[PDB]
Design a protein around this ligand. Structure first.
Ligand SMILES: CC(C)Cn1c(=O)n(C)c(=O)c2nc[nH]c21
Ligand SMILES: CC(C)Cn1c(=O)n(C)c(=O)c2nc[nH]c21
Ligand SMILES: [Mg+2]
Ligand SMILES: [Mg+2]
Ligand SMILES: [Zn+2]
Ligand SMILES: [Zn+2]
Lengths: 324, 326
């Protein structure tokens, strides 16, 4: 008659494939099911012999290792993985990548922010936290994310890779590590040039080229909120600042340097996103379009719109601050 | 009168400056004193307001954080540190390096192998160890040595940097982290090339040129046993293979791969050092000699000798196994 929520309706399974899928409409359970479906759907369960029950526990254990942060939480996790999923279709990645690579992109996307503490690397380093000390100031967050990802995959009951020859595990593990560590925005500029370089004459056969592409791909999905529909996109800006301000305050109480872009007294939903969209998002997606031109209409388009919308929104804010 | 051991004689203090020092005669405490003496003698206690007592609690704490592996232990720690000390004099480093770099080189050497487990990075990764998982297969050992180093310095009673301004702290931490991580032999080639490349036209005023020099410097001190006198050097080779075989054993009975150079059946004290001296040691100290010629005679020399000796041993060593085997 009427089936429970964790039984995705054939409509859901259809929307899930596109970047428009409203990420806010579901509860963890439902989202967990979505992720589950993704692995079966991409043939990952099939091509690697992933025990379906294990996939269930793994995802459940993954969801449990994400803190309840305003921004870097389980729903964000979902966003990145779902956006990665979208791009697999939109770009026909299965025509360019081996099922193994696809496994990497997806698993990596899902694990990229495991146990994120709600404070960036700059804070971890200045506050000389355990993460900072443990990782010798080298992308402590990402290094931690990655470690937790594999601590989980080390639990036999969650080891969704239990039936992969050891030679494969090594290749998958390497790839994931690379990708997850590539999400530290500190390395953005560096990664973009490496990619832009090999781009002058891309080569899907060349391995280094492909690793950069996978790197660029996970980065895209990771900060792809602004690509999403304006209603689903805006609320995340609030979550983000909610986190940035939480850190800027703490930094102030503890007398640690405060990044201006996180300063509660200088930031507004507008000024924050305008620079990010114009100078980080657009350019990155721009160069990716060179390889997958259908990305221009599906992701570059909403970005241009959000840029204008936010730019105009500041234009307005300035006029108001003026009257006063 | 007859003073106690922890009281260094002016002879020892004099011997501590040459690479011919018998790193075997001394016991932990005496060695701690030698280390302590180096920090004073180099002007580090002076130029960094190091509380003289903290310096001792720290050395004590560092020592207590080294395992009792046949090779990778506190006495090795002391070797590398004492070698670095020698290098500073022999090469007049106080002329080309700031006291901050001299600080970095010394502290980095003393901490370079902190809490070493006894099994290399290859074992850590393949055995999917807690360390390999923690540092995502990235120089997990060195990364660890480094972390422990700073957790020790995080203790107020062991913090020899407590009187250094925060900016200088950051600067030192950065350098220490770079040098310790640079001791991962897996990077020996990469690092060597960078140095030889910057070596085409070396510039003592170029930060990058100096960073490679320091990396090369600590690497030289780290694997500098064979540079020492035959009787001081040799016993270390045994200690190393004892640790190597221990691993290859564990590896064979855990189904994990085993390196030939660590295989109990294909490695003699000789075959291990002949190749290592000819392809790793000599080459490195050679390029370093371009920068410091006096290095050739005091270190490149005992290496050629060592190389010749081991090659000699290998012959009689081989002949012997031609009486064995049916
Ligand atoms: C400095 C800037 C890149 C910081 N930054 C960021 O890292 N992410 C992920 C954002 O979404 C964002 N939005 C504005 N600034 C941002
Ligand atoms: C990785 C490292 C153990 C290699 N290593 C070393 O450090 N020393 C001092 C040797 O004598 C040696 N001989 C072979 N490999 C060696
Ligand atoms: Mg991140
Ligand atoms: Mg080491
Ligand atoms: Zn993220
Ligand atoms: Zn060492």
């Amino acid at each position: 008659p009427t089936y429970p929520k964790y039984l995705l309706s054939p409509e859901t399974i259809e929307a899930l494939r596109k970047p428009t899928f409203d990420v806010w409409l579901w509860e963890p359970n439902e989202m967990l099911s979505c992720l589950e479906h993704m692995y079966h759907d991409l043939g990952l369960v099939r091509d690697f012999s992933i025990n379906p029950v294990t996939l269930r526990r793994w995802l459940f254990c993954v969801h449990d290792n994400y803190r309840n942060n305003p921004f870097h939480n389980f729903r964000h996790c979902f966003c990145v993985a779902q956006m990665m999923y979208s791009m697999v279709w939109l770009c026909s990645l299965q025509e360019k990548f081996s099922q193994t690579d696809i496994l990497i992109l997806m698993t990596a996307a899902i694990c990229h922010d495991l146990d994120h503490p709600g404070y960036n690397n700059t804070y971890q380093i200045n506050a000389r936290t355990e993460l900072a000390v443990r990782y010798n100031d080298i992308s402590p967050l990402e290094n931690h994310h990655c470690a937790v990802a594999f601590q989980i995959l080390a639990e036999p009951e969650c080891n969704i890779f239990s039936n992969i020859p050891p030679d494969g595990f090594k290749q998958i593990r390497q790839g994931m590590i690379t990708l997850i560590l590539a999400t530290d925005m500190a390395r953005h500029a560096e990664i973009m040039d490496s990619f832009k370089e090999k781009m002058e004459n891309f080569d899907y056969s060349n391995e280094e080229h492909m690793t950069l592409l996978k790197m660029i791909l996970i980065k895209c999905c990771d900060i792809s909120n602004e690509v999403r529909p304006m209603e689903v996109a805006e609320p995340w800006v609030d979550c983000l600042l909610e986190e940035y301000f939480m850190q800027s305050d703490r930094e102030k109480s503890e007398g640690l340097p405060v990044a201006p872009f996180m300063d509660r007294d200088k930031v507004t939903k507008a000024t924050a996103q305008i620079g990010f969209i114009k100078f980080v998002l657009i350019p990155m997606f721009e160069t990716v379009t060179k390889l997958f031109p259908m990305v221009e209409e599906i992701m570059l388009q909403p970005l241009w719109e959000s840029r204008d919308r936010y730019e105009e929104l500041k234009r307005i804010d300035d006029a108001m601050k003026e009257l006063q």
